[PDB]
Structure formats: C-alpha cells, structure tokens
Design a protein around this nucleic acid. Structure first.
Ligand SMILES: [Mg+2]
Ligand SMILES: [Mg+2]
Ligand SMILES: [Mg+2]
Ligand SMILES: [Mg+2]
Ligand SMILES: [Mg+2]
Ligand SMILES: [Mg+2]
Ligand SMILES: [Mg+2]
Ligand SMILES: [Mg+2]
Lengths: 178, 50, 79, 116, 136
RNA sequence: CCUCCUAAAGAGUAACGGAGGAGCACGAAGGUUGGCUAAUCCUGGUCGGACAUCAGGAGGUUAGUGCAAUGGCAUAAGCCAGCUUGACUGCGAGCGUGACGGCGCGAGCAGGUGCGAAAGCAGGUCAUAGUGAUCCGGUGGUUCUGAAUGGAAGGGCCAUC
RNA sequence: CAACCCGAUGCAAACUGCGAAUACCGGAGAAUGUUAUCACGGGAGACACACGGCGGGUGCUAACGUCCGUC
RNA sequence: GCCUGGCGGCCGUAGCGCGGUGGUCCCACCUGACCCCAUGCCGAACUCAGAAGUGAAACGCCGUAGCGCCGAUGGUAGUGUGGGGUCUCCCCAUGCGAGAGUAGGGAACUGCCAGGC
C-alpha cells in the first residue's frame, strides 16, 4: 500500500482543493488495475497461450484467467469456446503495489518511451494504454522467454469525468507526455 | 439410428433388468448407474451397457 | 409442390372457465405450450409437463391477474 | 445494486414458501445488524420479532452481528415465537448464503425449540 | 413499375374492401387526388397516371403517392384445369377505398395542379375528385 | 407424424389451399443444490483489423433455446459448476381427448434413491414431431399349467427382441 | 449511393403495446314447453345433397363453379 | 405524527429523466482479512472480525411534466335480431359500441412488525 498511503496523503487533499471537493469520500480513488493481454492466436501454437499466461502470472502476483471466445462469429475463426486471452485484474494491495511496480520500474524500463498518452482515458474517466511489448520487467527470467509479448492495461477510477481522471495519476508519478 | 438398445442387468442374482439406448459409437464405456430391483425390492447397482 | 400437411386436433384451451364443480383435479385449462398464458396459483397448481394447469382440491375456479407485469394466474378457492 | 441481486436470489424460495403457505421466519442481514421476524402466511402481518436493533438484546450483546452475537437474536425470536404458541416454521435466508450469521441464530432458534 | 422489394410471403388471400381509408386530408402537399370510390390500383395504373401527372406540371412543384400496391393478386394460365395450387403472382394491386388519398401536389398553381390530376384520373378505375390542404 | 394461417376471439372444420419441418439427439443435452445473465452500439486499449480478448457507458427478454413453427421462459426452460441416477418399481383420486383400438395430464399412497442445512424438488429432457396394431416366433424369469403318474416338451404369466 | 435513428403517411391470412358485437362454458331465478333431457336396450335407414343469406379459401370477390363454417 | 429498516397489497396517473436533499440512529458505502467461506483472476461478489471517515455512489425522500403511463364527453368503425337497396358494397329500426385522437388526469396510494425523534 506504499503508493496507496501517498494517495490519502499528498493526493486526496491536492484534489480536495484543486477540484474543490466537499467530501473526502469523493476524491477519485484508484479502482483496481485490470490487465488483459488478448494473446489470441492459439490455433497455430496453442501453447503460446499458457505462455502469455505464465508471463502474466509473473507480471502479476496472481493467477491468470485464460479467457474464452463468446460470439464465435469470427472471421479469424473462434467457436464459442476456444481460449483467446487472460485478463487478470488487480487485487487491492497487489494492485497498488503493481501501480508501483510500473510507473517506477516498468514504464521506466522503456524502449524509447518519450512521453505517455494524455488521452488514453475514456468518457467516464478511466485510462487504458497498451505497453506495445512486455518490457521483460520482473518476470520469469529475462532473456529466457519467447516471441515478444505485449499486452494491455486499464486503471478505471471512480472519476466522474475524464478530466478528474487526469488529476488522479497526475498526483502520483504518471510519466505522461507534456 | 446408430443408437443401439442396452440391457441394464442387476448385480443381484435376480434376472431383473432395465432397458434403454446408447451411442456406442462415442460412448464405449460400459454404463452402470444403480436403480431399483423389484425382485429384491431394494435399490442396487445395475450394469451391462455397451 | 410442398404446401400441405398440418397437425391434428390438439385441443388445448379452457375446459373449466370461471368457477366450476372443480373435482379433485379437472383441468381448468389445458392450453399447453404456456406458463404465462395461464399460471399455476392458489389451491390449484400442478402444471404438468405439458404446461397443463392442474387444479387440486375441489371447489370453484377464480381466474385472476396478479403480480408484476400482468400474469393471468389461475386458482381454485373453496365453494 | 448489490441489494437488488440478493432479492431475486430469495424471490425463489420466498415464492415456494407462499406456495405451501407456511409461516416463514424472515431473517434480514446488515453490516452492523442482524434482524429476525416470523411473518404470517398472508405475508402482511408479523407474529413475532427480535433484532439486534433492540436495546434489551443489544446490551447483553458485545457487537451487533458477531455470529455468537447474531445468535441470541435467533434464540430470542425462538422463545419469543414459542410463548406466542408458535412452532414449526420455515426459514428464509432471504438470499443470504446460509453459512455465516444467518447459518447461526437459525441453530439458535432451532436449539431454542423452534421446529424447522 | 412500383412493387415491394421484399415480402415474407409470396401470395395473399383474396379478401375484400370496407370503404373509408385513413389518408383523408392532405398532409404533404396541398391538393392531391381523393378516392370517392372503392377499388384497387394495379400499381401499373398509379404509374401510368403519375407520368401523365408529371408531364403536365412540367417540373415545377413536388408530388406524392400515398397509395401503394403491396398486394400480390395471382392469375391462372389459360388452358389449365382448376384447383391445382394457387396461381402465380402476375401483378401487384393497391387496395383503396372512399376517402383514400392518391397523390398530392404543392409547388404549383392550383389552376395547374387541378388541371393535371384530371389528366391523371383519366387513367384510373376509381372515380376520384380534387382536394385542398385545409387548415383542419 | 409435428407447426402456423385458412378457422368468423371455446373445441373442432374442407380444397391437387398458402408456408415449413419429423422417422431423431443426448449417461448428459437427465436429477438436484449452489451461483450467473444477454444481443447490439459508443468510447478508450500491444500485436487486434468489419468482426476476437480487455475497460467502462448506453442498451434492455432485439440474445439464447440440440433440430421446424407456434406458444413459453428472468422464480428463468437460457448459462456455469459440485454431487448424483427419480430416464426408479408397484399403484393411482380425478380429468382431458378419441367411433374404436388407443393417446395424454395427474396430486396423492407403498417400497426403496438422490440432491439440499432445510422447506422441498426429481416417475427424463420448455412443451407440442422422432412412429407400426395383431399374428408367428426368439431370449430371460416363474416350482401357474403340463393328457395314466413323476419329470419333460409345449402352453400361460411377467420382462424384452 | 444509401441502412440505422427522428418526426409526418399508409399496408398485413401466416403483425399486435389495443379491442367489440357475440358465441360458448358455469351459477341463480320466474314463466312457459303433452320431458322437450340423459342412460340402457329391439328395429332402422343414411354416409352422391341442392339452392338462397351471412363469414371465407379457391376461381376472374367469373360460372346453375368448387371446398369449408353456419342459418 | 416526522424519519428509517424488514415483509406484503396493488402493479406505469406506482416508471424514466432532471434538480434539490438525508446521516457515526437505520441504511449505505467504508476498514481489516490468518481465518469461516469465496474468486474457472480478483475479499469485485459472496464471507467473517470491525474502527476511522463520508453521505460521494447507491438508496430513501422532496420538487419538476421533458419522455412514459391513465384517460373521457361527443363523433367515428364494427356488430346481434328485423327490414331494405345492391356489380363484389352499403342503408334503415333497434340493442351492444371500439381503436386512434382530443379534453383532461398524473411526479402512487396502502397495511403489519421493529427502531430512532
Ligand atoms: Mg378456434
Ligand atoms: Mg475497440
Ligand atoms: Mg424440445
Ligand atoms: Mg367461434
Ligand atoms: Mg362413402
Ligand atoms: Mg359425401
Ligand atoms: Mg356441403
Ligand atoms: Mg353449386
């Protein structure tokens, strides 16, 4: 909860005045990181799936949820069932600890990262940016992996607006781009 | 069709038995499930089922 | 040419409209292929496999309309 | 609404109880409290009741809704619904997974004498 | 030359009319043709009339057609026995009844519109009349 | 044989009338207990593009239903999982529907099951198609009968091909 | 070039967020009706109908046409 | 009587939207989570032990008629029996009499038990 405390400390108040909030029980709280990584493919290999899973199982201290299809009406293929991903949301402590893991060592462990999207947000006020490629960060070994990786990440905050979404993260150490 | 008829026999010495169908083309495992044996008037384990 | 054929009788309907003698279990309504057309309620219920409004204990028939979203509902109070 | 969900879960048996028209023993739960009441078949008038929201019980209680605390609540409605000449009733966990406090109290009213 | 692009069914029962349509008064132009009689337009008539209608107004103004065929109407071949399956959809009729609003004009003098719908009802079974916009 | 219209708001109705389907499928796609709920669009997201997976918002049975159509379904019958064998045996108040043969619905009772803490639910599948009477025989069971008597062949009865 | 959506206008046997007359089913009541009603049993004949009215399929809302419902 | 919770009646003039609003009573979030129990990943949900905080969300109220919804009187359509004209349609007598639309209504009402003022 390292960064978690920071929220209650530096954050919250920063927003309480900047956003001029009336109740501490309003300040846009951080509502679990999601993580997905729609590996897909499978068919060709099928093993790369559990690979993309084991990879996530490392990126995160929890257990990957190898998701399935749904519509089946997919040109690519897919038939109702059939593996195709591994969301794996974040759990409170592990969540913030993760929010710490990255932004402090992940985003830092770049490839050429010269700023971060300031519009990866939504309408409600939630951000979700793709890493483009797993930076090999604290995962099961480094030079010991497989054909690339990459994945997606979403924050999702109680922010009533994308604007308020900016305040959050901004109060933290979100590198962003400006 | 492809659904052959099966004869679930009683594990008890009684010659009593049940009848139904099965798709041996995909379910080679001999079916058993336990039913009621009128003769002994007591439930038991019925067998025999392609 | 294709056009032809058709099912047989298949009555299914109200055979015990409103209050009736309602014996131990007449029918009150055999309008199969339903649940909402006629719902099992009151002293009467059953609603056999073929969605046939059973009708228990002897008495009169009511034919009501209760619960959220219309819902006919049949039952048999005492007489 | 997490509440709107719990309702439909019980809307089932709650209808089954009506079907049989048996005096059900409702039991609503909440973070800080544990309620209980024996409503009549008609589901309009309640015969008895006993909830942690009543001083008499709260006093003798450490913390409202503490299992062993959400037990006397049942033992109470029990006798309370026995001196009334009431007995042999149906339990309605009202959507609450029969396992925690609701699990208890039920054994309380059960042990107390209630038939169910 | 005006029929439905699709129909869940190939043939419709004979049926019949019952007078008094719905489109009583104009609600698009300010003139138009009225029913006055019960009948049915072979859809080919509605077009035959439209052409005469258009080619009279020169171009000025706009026109409307509140009537539509949608009705199959079959026919049985010549030398062919009876009762051997329903005939084949030959054309498409447009059931109309008294009060029915056939067409409608607006951007053209009533003197023209009038002397235009006449050159229309000439190519029509049902006896039509003339109508105005009417504030109500 | 099943479904809709024809069919005039009970049942039922004809045509070489207008339109489709069945001759099966499932040891789970049955039972129960526990839990879940869509289609579609918008927006924002590595490879993800018309169309995979993810996040939110709108949406509300327009999804789904093993297979036609109609009716039905959120207490879901629709979906997931645990454990199971009630797709049990003998009966059956009372009804519906047939000229008849017959077909259908069925609470409750007796014996034994299963699932559940429990109330309770289960006598196959959401229902309505998935079917062949009789005879002549085949198989298993039965101390019913068995042409002088004891057996036996054969016959009956029950299950079944 | 145009669907979706929005407002204005229609159409439907296999459309329905509405909805009659009315028929039908059951209950109570008076009057009337040589029991008209139901059950069982002896004897039947009859299962080519026709026209007209009304509601329809089919035909051309043709036929002293044809196939139903009903009088 | 004011407010709140549980359970029902009746199910749109009871709903939706929008604005205001209530709190450490009740409720809600909320805290903590080895554990009971739970996640085809997550203490999100269920589940347990409970502060600190806030009514923010939800919920409950109140106001508001923009979207629902209820909805006549009158006229219109249809129709039973009797009669009449008639190209397949319609008229008259007389009973029954819609649907839509208009007037207008309308921001639910109500019982039982419990807890706060
Ligand atoms: Mg009928
Ligand atoms: Mg996208
Ligand atoms: Mg089926
Ligand atoms: Mg009729
Ligand atoms: Mg004959
Ligand atoms: Mg004849
Ligand atoms: Mg005849
Ligand atoms: Mg003739």
């Amino acid at each position: 909860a390292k960064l978690h405390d920071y929220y209650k400390d530096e954050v919250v108040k920063k927003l309480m005045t900047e956003f001029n909030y009336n109740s501490v029980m309003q300040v846009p709280r951080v509502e679990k990181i999601t993580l997905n990584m729609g590996v897909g493919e499978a068919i060709a290999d099928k093993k790369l799936l559990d690979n993309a899973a084991a990879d996530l199982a490392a990126i995160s201290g929890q257990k990957p949820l190898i998701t399935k299809a749904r519509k089946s009406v997919a040109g690519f293929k897919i038939r109702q069932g059939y593996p195709i991903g591994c969301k794996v949301t974040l759990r409170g402590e592990r969540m913030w600890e993760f929010f710490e893991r990255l932004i402090t060592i992940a985003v830092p462990r770049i490839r050429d990262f010269r700023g971060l999207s300031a519009k990866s947000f939504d309408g409600r006020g939630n951000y979700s940016m793709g890493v483009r490629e797993q930076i090999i960060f604290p995962e099961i070994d480094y030079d010991k992996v497989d054909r690339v990786r990459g994945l997606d990440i979403t924050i999702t905050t109680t922010a009533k607006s994308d604007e308020e979404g900016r305040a959050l993260l901004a109060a933290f150490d979100f590198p962003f781009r400006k | 069709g492809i659904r052959e008829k099966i004869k679930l026999v009683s594990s008890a010495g009684t010659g009593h038995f049940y009848t139904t169908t099965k798709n041996k083309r995909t379910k080679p495992e001999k079916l058993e499930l336990k039913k009621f044996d009128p003769v002994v008037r007591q439930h038991v384990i019925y067998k025999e089922a392609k | 040419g294709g056009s032809t054929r058709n099912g047989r009788d298949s009555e299914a309907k109200r055979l015990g409209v409103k209050r009736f003698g309602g014996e131990s279990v007449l029918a009150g309504s055999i309008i199969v292929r339903q649940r909402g057309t006629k719902f099992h309620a009151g002293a009467n219920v059953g609603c056999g496999r073929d969605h046939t409004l059973f009708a228990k204990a002897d008495g009169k028939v009511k034919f009501e309309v209760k619960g959220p979203k219309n819902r006919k509902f049949i039952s048999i109070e005492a007489e | 609404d997490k509440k709107s969900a719990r309702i439909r879960r019980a809307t089932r048996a709650r209808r089954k109880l009506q079907e049989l028209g048996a005096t059900r023993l409702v039991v609503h739960r909440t973070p800080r409290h544990i309620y209980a009441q024996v409503i009549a078949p008609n589901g309009s008038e309640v015969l008895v009741a006993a909830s942690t929201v009543e001083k008499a019980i709260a006093e003798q209680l450490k913390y409202t809704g503490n299992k062993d605390a959400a037990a006397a609540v049942g033992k109470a409605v029990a006798e309370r619904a026995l001196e009334k000449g009431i007995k042999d009733v149906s339990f309605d966990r009202s959507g609450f997974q029969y396992h925690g406090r609701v699990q208890a109290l039920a054994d309380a009213a059960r042990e107390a004498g209630l038939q169910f | 030359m005006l029929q439905p692009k699709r129909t869940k069914f190939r043939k419709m029962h004979k049926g019949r009319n019952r007078g008094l349509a719905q489109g009583t008064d104009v609600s698009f132009g300010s003139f138009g043709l009225k029913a006055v009689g019960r009948g049915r337009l072979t859809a080919r008539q509605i077009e035959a009339a439209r052409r005469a209608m258009t080619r009279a107004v020169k171009r000025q103004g706009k026109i409307w057609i509140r009537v539509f065929p949608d009705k199959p109407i079959t026919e049985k071949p010549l030398a062919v026995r009876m009762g051997k399956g329903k005939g084949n959809v030959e054309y498409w009729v447009a059931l109309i009844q008294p009060g029915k609003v056939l067409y409608e004009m607006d951007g053209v003098p009533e003197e023209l519109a009038r002397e235009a719908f006449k050159l229309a009802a000439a190519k029509l079974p049902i006896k039509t009349t003339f109508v105005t916009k009417t504030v109500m």
